Amino acid sequence: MIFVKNLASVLSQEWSSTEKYPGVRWKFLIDADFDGSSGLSLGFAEIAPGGDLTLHYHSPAEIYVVTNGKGILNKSGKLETIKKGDVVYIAGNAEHALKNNGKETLEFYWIFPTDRFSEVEAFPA
Amino acid sequence: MIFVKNLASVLSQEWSSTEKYPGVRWKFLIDADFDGSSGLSLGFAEIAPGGDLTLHYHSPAEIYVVTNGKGILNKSGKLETIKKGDVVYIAGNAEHALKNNGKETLEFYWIFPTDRFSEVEAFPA
Ligand SMILES: C[SH](C)CCC(=O)O
Ligand SMILES: C[SH](C)CCC(=O)O
Ligand SMILES: [Mn+2]
Ligand SMILES: [Mn+2]
Structure with a gap:
């Protein structure tokens, strides 16, 4: 399809959320649990100001x-700023986090x- | 990484392009050939007005x-308009095309x- x-x-x-990620919420847009798509899955997330997709x-x-918006990407310990227009690659098993240190929603x-x-x-x- | x-x-x-797809150009942003990355790859594409990512x-x-911008997605014969903020899932081996019928660049x-x-x-x- x-x-x-x-x-x-x-x-x-x-919206989905979990205690371990303060200020983060998400929805599933392309996902076999909802769509019967396969091979790739995609969600949309919002991080409120101060929110943190905790290191994982x-x-x-x-x-x-x-x-x-803008935020701070934790690259297994090394911080880098990210913003609208960026894409990010995370290798399998690499520890990463995303913090919203801005005033606008990070999406x-x-x-x-x-x-x-x-x-x-x-x-x- | x-x-x-x-x-x-x-x-x-x-910019990459081919005579195969007039009015289309792209760059690779996450790709093994450039980054040594694996599992997923991602590029950024532009379709000029009148350009067509031909049915394939x-x-x-x-x-x-x-x-x-805006475009017309060909879903194996059933057309649907897409625009900024849309995501598209294309199943493996499904026939698809993307035409820019608008005045602005489709990106x-x-x-x-x-x-x-x-x-x-x-x-x-
Ligand atoms: C936004 S969550 C549903 C988890 C995100 C992640 O693992 O990078
Ligand atoms: C923008 S192109 C490099 C081809 C993308 C596709 O397979 O639909
Ligand atoms: Mn993650
Ligand atoms: Mn394709």
Whole structure:
């Protein structure tokens, strides 16, 4: 199949969040648990000011596509600023974090080379 | 490795194009041939007004993330307009095309679950 999604497409899907990531919420836009797509999966995340996608890692490589705001990417200990217009590559099992130190919402898509988000087990650093 | 890319980062890289796709050009932002990265690869593409990413297919699944402009996505014969903020899922081997019928540049990222772009074999449909 071929399909098109945007935030409006997933209006009926509630935002997801977890205690370990303060100020972060997300929705699944391309995901086998919702769509029967496979091979790649994609979500959309918002990080509120002060929010932190806490240091973690997981087996699959990952890409972030930053679409709004600015933040601080923790590259396994080395900090680098990121902003709208950036893409980020995270090698499999590399520890990474994303902090929103700005006043605007930090927004990005993530992509995994998996059918679904639930196949990706996130381990804390 | 973990790294960040944007258009500024790849200024030194020349735009790629082929007579196969008039009015289309691209750069590689996350790609084994440039970065030694693996698992996922990503490029940035532009389609000029009247440009056509001609109907084609390839083995791996693909995602588009539209960052600007508007286009007509050909979903194996069923057309749908896409615009900034849309993401597109294309199943492996599904026939797809992307035409820019608008006045502004159609810009998007593409993502493959492959180490590099050059290993993807596209066939005209
Ligand atoms: C935004 S979350 C649903 C997890 C993000 C990540 O693991 O990089
Ligand atoms: C922008 S191109 C380098 C081809 C992308 C695609 O396979 O749809
Ligand atoms: Mn991650
Ligand atoms: Mn394609």
